[PDB]
């Protein structure tokens, strides 16, 4: 008599080879094991028993003897590769393909530590390679409770908590990116030619389009005076980008911010990534069926309105500013079966008509943290490396979310981080120190100094 044999699920490693997912022996068959538990619930995901629906959507041959299936995260997206082929009693089953993740969990743990128990999300990207060095969504849960079947009570402890431990804030958490988009908006205006690196704008504390008497007010009521590209970035002036978005138009704004990855998903291998929203004139005609008003473009110049962005879309934009426009999609899976995965649908690189604008916007982001009048100047006083970042706030009872993106070292980008702290208020005061703690753990040795590898200038 012949009898089928199930295959063993592929092992999951981090970027340094620490095991993220084993298989443990049980009797009356292997169970999947997550030896780091909550530190990867939203990155790797988990597996569970196979339901009524997914059984009529799986090979009865290859999945014979396989009673569990990927549910979310990496286990699902690469369920095919991690599964394998069955054997027969001896045709031996070929074990599932092993996956090496890009995440360094010495940075994943340091990021969760930097979040300090607050609800939110942290995403770290290596801009030259696209490796997702960290993917953090707080709070967490133990993925080892669904592998065997989770008690309908313990599920409720997850489901009926208002902190939402099941919410993957990195992938399905959509927030108005706020002031953090202003570097990309500046590049949109600089590219079109409506604004030049030295062209000035007087800030009386408000902006009016040449038709209405209505005033679009600056976050500083009394104004910043004459502001240029750099002054507009390290002070995050709203009137400068009110004026920039006006002279640019939403037709060429939505097109530019789309090439930065806003609108649809950015990553290569992230299950259930929300597209986000980059509003255009065609969207509002479909969705709301009303003509686009020129006042709706000005709120977009400072990252507001109906615009929706996921914390990974933000981090990819941060890596893009670090990468000088070379488009490489973020990806968790570093290698599959020992070779890196290939992007089937790449994104075109962002080729500016004056490539020096990259260094000018980066220098504006650079003075955000280190300038004498930067919003996050206190963060730069405690730094051993140059940080080209920018703080912001998201729009929302309770307060509003604090945001801060940034890459470092500014002159040789090795890390790109985007942080969203729920109800943090001060992008400069809470979200900025979290980036610097995440960036510190990646760049600093264990004695507080910058690593030898990253110090040399290029």
Ligand X SMILES: *C(=O)N1C[C@H](NOS(=O)(=O)O)CC[C@H]1C(=O)NNC(=O)[C@@H]1CCNC1
Nearer to ligand X, 49 or 373 (CB): 373
Q: Which of 66, 105, 108, 236 binds ligand X (CB under 6 A)?
A: 236
Residues belonging to the active site: 179
Q: Is 392 a binder of ligand X (CB under 6 A)? A: yes
Q: Which is nearer to ligand X, 47 or 408 (CB)?
A: 408
Contacting residue, 280, 308, 318, 391, with ligand X by CB under 6 A? 391
Q: Which of 128, 140, 426, 437 binds ligand X (CB under 6 A)?
A: 426
Strands 12-13, 99-101: parallel, antiparallel or unpaired by DSSP?
parallel
Binding-site residue total for ligand X (CB under 6 A)? 14
* Residue 128 vs 426, nearer CB to ligand X: 426
**Region near ligand X per CB under 6 A, out of 191-199, 350-358, 387-395, 446-454:** 387-395
Identify which of 280, 309, 276 has the alpha carbon closest to the alpha carbon of residue 178: 309
Q: Which is nearer to ligand X, 139 or 279 (CB)?
A: 279
Binding test (CB under 6 A) with ligand X, winner from 310, 375, 383, 414: 375
Please report, as residue ranges, which positions from 274 to 313 form the binding site for ligand X (by CB under 6 A).
302
Nearer to ligand X, 46 or 241 (CB): 241
Q: Which of residues 139-178 bind ligand X (CB under 6 A)?
A: 178
Nearest approach, Cβ of 326 to ligand X (angstroms)? 28
Q: How far apart are CB 245 and ligand X at their closest, in Å? A: 13
Q: What residues numbered 206-235 form the site for ligand X, per CB under 6 A?
A: 217, 219
Which residue is associated with the tokens 């040449």? 210
User: Which range touches ligand X (CB under 6 A), out of 133-141, 256-264, 426-434, 440-448?
Assistant: 426-434
**Does 238 interact with ligand X (rule: CB under 6 A)?**
yes
Q: Which of 165, 178 has the CB closer to ligand X?
A: 178
> Binding residues for ligand X, per CB under 6 A?
178-179, 217, 219, 236, 238, 302, 375, 391-393, 426-428
């Amino acid at each position: 008599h012949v009898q089928p044999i199930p295959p063993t699920r592929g092992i999951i490693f981090d970027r340094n080879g620490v095991i993220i997912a084993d298989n443990r022996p049980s009797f009356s068959q292997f169970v999947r094991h997550y030896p780091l538990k909550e530190h990867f619930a939203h990155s790797v995901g988990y597996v569970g028993r196979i339901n009524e629906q997914e059984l009529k959507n799986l090979d009865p041959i290859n999945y014979s003897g396989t009673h569990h299936i990927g549910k979310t995260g990496i286990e699902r997206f690469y369920e095919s590769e991690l599964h394998g082929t069955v054997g027969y009693e001896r045709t031996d089953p070929i074990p599932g393909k092993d996956i090496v993740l890009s995440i360094d969990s010495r940075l994943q743990e340091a990021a969760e530590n930097a979040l300090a128990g607050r609800r939110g999300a942290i995403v770290a990207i290596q801009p030259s390679t696209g490796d997702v060095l960290a993917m953090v969504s707080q709070p967490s849960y133990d993925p080892n409770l669904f592998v065997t079947g989770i008690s309908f009570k313990a599920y409720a402890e997850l489901r009926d908590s208002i902190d939402r431990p099941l919410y993957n804030r990195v992938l399905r958490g959509l927030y108005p990116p706020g002031s953090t988009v202003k570097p990309a908006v500046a590049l949109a205006g600089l590219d079109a030619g409506v604004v030049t690196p030295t062209s000035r704008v007087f800030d009386p504390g408000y902006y009016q389009l040449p038709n209405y008497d209505h005033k679009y007010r600056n976050w500083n009521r009394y104004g910043d005076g004459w502001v240029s590209l750099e002054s507009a970035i390290y002070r995050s002036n709203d009137t400068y980008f009110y004026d920039l978005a006006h002279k640019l138009g939403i037709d060429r704004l939505h097109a530019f911010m789309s090439r930065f990855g806003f609108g649809q998903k950015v990553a290569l291998d992230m299950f259930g990534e929300a597209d986000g929203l980059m509003p255009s004139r065609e969207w509002k005609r479909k969705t709301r069926r009303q003509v686009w008003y020129p006042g709706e473009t000005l709120i977009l110049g400072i990252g507001q309105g109906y615009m929706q962005a996921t914390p990974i879309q933000l981090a990819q934009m941060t890596a893009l500013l670090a990468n000088k426009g070379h488009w490489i999609r973020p990806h968790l899976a570093k290698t599959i079966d020992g070779q890196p995965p290939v992007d089937p649908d790449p994104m075109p690189d962002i080729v500016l008509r004056d490539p020096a604008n990259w260094d000018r916007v980066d220098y504006g982001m650079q003075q955000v943290v280190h300038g004498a009048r930067g919003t996050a100047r206190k963060v730069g006083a405690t730094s051993a490396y140059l940080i080209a970042g920018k703080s912001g706030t998201a729009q929302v009872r309770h307060r509003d979310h604090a945001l801060f993106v940034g890459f470092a070292p500014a002159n040789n980008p090795q890390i790109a981080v985007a942080v969203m702290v729920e109800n943090g208020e001060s992008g400069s005061g809470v979200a900025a120190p979290v980036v610097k703690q995440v960036m510190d753990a990646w760049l600093l040795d264990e004695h507080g100094k910058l690593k030898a590898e990253y110090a040399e200038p290029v």
